[PDB]
């Protein structure tokens, strides 16, 4: 394998392109990178644990990995309070140790092992143009991916459960016993409009639906893996697609960009898979919590929060949504589709219920609204929390902000990568990725436009 | 300090409303656009002058031949955008003319601002909003924003004037 520009045609800054047809060294690069990923998981988790203050809420400490563990129902109890730090520590250590095994394997394959696996094995040797084998690899991975989804299912059903923020009697780890197998609900979720009030799959709001989804996902992924191992690409797909390593990279880049945008939206809007007791309030929650907090204060001062018109003529604390639902007043009117386990007790069939808002408020609801309102996912780049005009004494940026901003940026740059590699794969398949041939420049044989 | 100067010119001079600044914005943004589109067009109409994927090595500074196809570029942009450069000399002059002209025009506007000769207001809309309290535009909203900036920034930004503005006279909307 050439490791210079004269032997490969690729400069040092495009050096990893020299691995396109070196399957052994490419496999080494891949396993060592996987090692990097697992290393970060373990090391960052151990950092978060060493920096963790167990009594202080998770979203106040710059944590993004321990919230993921706690949502899975490890190390936490009711309302997300930490019972034991050891499960987080164990998760970190196991990732950190496995990272070394993957690093070794990667450095081995990248440096010492065969540069090309074609000779060595028919099983591991692949040619980019060999559609049957590339679909075999798709299939083996689809079966492991579906197995991982079923691993989530098993943890939620048979191995202690997962954190259900919607649990009766307060949020807590719950064992899911009736996951939603009904394909109408599960796939209906896929068919919901990605706009306010519906939210496509972002609006999944119960662990039963999430778990039933992962049973379907595991089943569909395992079936698709078996299909791809026992089949070959059909004619229409053989004709509409580019069959090359860079092409497959560009396809995966498009998929990754889509998933990055989706993850950004998920963490920003959904509080079921991302519980607010770990991730802090969504911005919709913080706005509604502000409206609620001053609803309670003013009501306790004796105001009629129902019949109090604001300076504009709309109700100061309560109004109607454009479809008539009773909602919180003020600019929060935009977040009237927000659902939260501390709010939903005060909602009637018509929306917010006056009888409930006048008699059934609880101190935990007021405390929760105060906490969520003061932890609005608003903050500066140097982590000065609250609105940008505030002074420097509050060190807080929401984990939702960090995760959403990061994955939007990564999704966008991966869309750019998709375009880069998809256009390059197309041009290289067609044979003009290196520039225009002077003798057969196509425009010289095309008629003038005018 | 520059950011303060920028916001000061917004709040006191309504400098975004100034046509001279607008011509400057057009010049600078058009200069960036021209830079990006020329670079990209040239890089993507390159002649195949070498065997490597690294197309950069396929250029000799002393070569007599153009390194990219102007005909292909012209056809591409003619069919994409409707028009295209067909004279490279005019293209490179235009790349100088646009940003330079924008800087000159913005400078003319700034010279106006030296004397408080500002495009601050549209008097027609001020007279109407004065007489018609239902009438609102984005222009009137920006006027309000400027009044807020001025009142809240003057005492600290101009400490020598000893501006004592008690809290009750500070303009502000409801709640906020």
């Amino acid at each position: 394998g050439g490791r210079d520009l004269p032997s490969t045609g690729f400069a040092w800054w495009s050096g990893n392109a020299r691995l396109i047809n070196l399957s052994g060294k490419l496999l080494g690069a891949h396993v060592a990178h996987a090692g990097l990923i697992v290393f970060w998981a373990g090391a960052m988790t151990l950092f978060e644990v060493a920096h963790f203050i167990p009594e202080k809420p998770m979203y106040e400490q710059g944590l993004i990995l321990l919230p993921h563990i706690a949502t899975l129902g490890w190390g936490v109890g009711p309302a997300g309070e930490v019972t034991d730090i050891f499960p987080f520590f164990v998760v970190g250590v196991l990732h950190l140790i496995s990272s070394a095994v993957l690093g070794l394997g990667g450095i081995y394959h990248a440096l010492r092992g065969p540069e090309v696996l074609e000779e060595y094995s028919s099983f591991f040797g692949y040619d980019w143009k060999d559609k049957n084998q590339m679909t075999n690899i798709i299939g083996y991975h689809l079966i492991l991916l579906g197995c991982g989804a079923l691993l989530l299912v098993f943890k939620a059903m048979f191995f202690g459960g997962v954190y259900d923020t919607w649990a009766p009697g307060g949020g807590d780890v719950r064992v899911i016993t009736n996951p939603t197998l009904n394909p109408a609900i599960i796939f209906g979720y896929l068919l919901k409009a990605p706009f306010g009030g519906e939210g496509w799959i972002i609006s999944v709001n119960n662990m039963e639906d999430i778990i039933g989804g992962h049973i379907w996902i595991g089943l569909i992924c395992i079936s698709g893996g078996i299909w791809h191992i026992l089949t070959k690409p059909f004619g229409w797909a053989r004709r509409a697609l580019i069959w090359s390593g860079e092409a497959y990279l560009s396809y995966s880049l498009g998929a990754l960009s889509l998933m990055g945008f989706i993850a950004s939206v998920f963490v920003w809007f959904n509080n079921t898979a991302y519980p607010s007791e770990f991730y802090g309030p969504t911005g919709m929650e913080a706005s509604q919590s502000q409206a609620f907090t001053f609803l309670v204060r003013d009501q306790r001062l004796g105001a009629n929060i129902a019949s109090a018109q604001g300076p504009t003529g709309l109700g100061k604390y309560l109004m109607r949504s454009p479809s008539g639902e009773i909602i919180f007043g003020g600019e929060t009117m935009r977040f009237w589709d927000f659902r939260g386990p501390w709010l939903e007790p005060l909602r009637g069939p018509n929306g917010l219920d006056l009888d409930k808002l006048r008699n059934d408020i609880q101190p935990w609801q007021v405390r929760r609204a105060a906490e969520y309102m003061t932890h609005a996912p608003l903050g500066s780049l140097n982590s000065v929390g609250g609105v940008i005009t505030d002074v420097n004494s509050f060190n807080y940026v929401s984990p939702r902000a960090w995760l959403a901003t990061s994955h939007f940026v990564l999704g966008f740059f991966f869309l750019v990568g998709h375009l880069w590699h998809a256009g390059r794969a197309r041009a290289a398949a067609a044979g003009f990725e290196k520039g225009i041939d002077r003798e057969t420049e196509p425009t010289l044989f095309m008629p003038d436009l005018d | 300090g520059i950011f303060r100067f920028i916001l000061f010119l917004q709040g006191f001079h309504n400098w975004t409303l100034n046509p001279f600044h607008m011509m400057g914005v057009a010049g600078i943004l058009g200069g960036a656009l021209l830079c990006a589109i020329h670079g990209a067009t040239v890089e993507n109409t390159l002649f195949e002058d070498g065997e490597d994927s690294n197309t950069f090595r396929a250029f000799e500074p002393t070569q007599a031949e153009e390194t990219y196809s102007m005909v292909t570029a012209n056809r591409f942009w003619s069919q994409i955008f409707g028009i295209a450069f067909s004279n490279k000399r005019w293209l490179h002059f235009f790349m100088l003319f646009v940003p330079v002209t924008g800087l000159w025009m913005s400078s003319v506007g700034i010279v106006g601002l030296a004397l408080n000769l500002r495009a601050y207001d549209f008097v027609s809309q001020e007279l109407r909003a004065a007489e018609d309290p239902e009438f609102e535009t984005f222009y009137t909203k920006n006027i309000l924003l400027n009044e807020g900036m001025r009142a809240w920034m003057a005492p600290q930004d101009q400490p020598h004037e000893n501006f004592i503005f008690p809290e009750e006279v500070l303009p502000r909307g409801n709640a906020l």
Partner: peptide, 30 residues
């Protein structure tokens, strides 16, 4: 009536665009 002035100048701009595209000087290889 200032509305008439604004629409007229905008229309002049758009019509210039149409003519510049539909009836441009045809680039020729010489």
């Amino acid at each position: 009536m200032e509305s008439v002035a604004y629409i007229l100048v905008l229309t002049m701009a758009l019509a210039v665009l149409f003519f510049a595209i539909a009836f441009r000087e045809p680039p020729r290889i010489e």
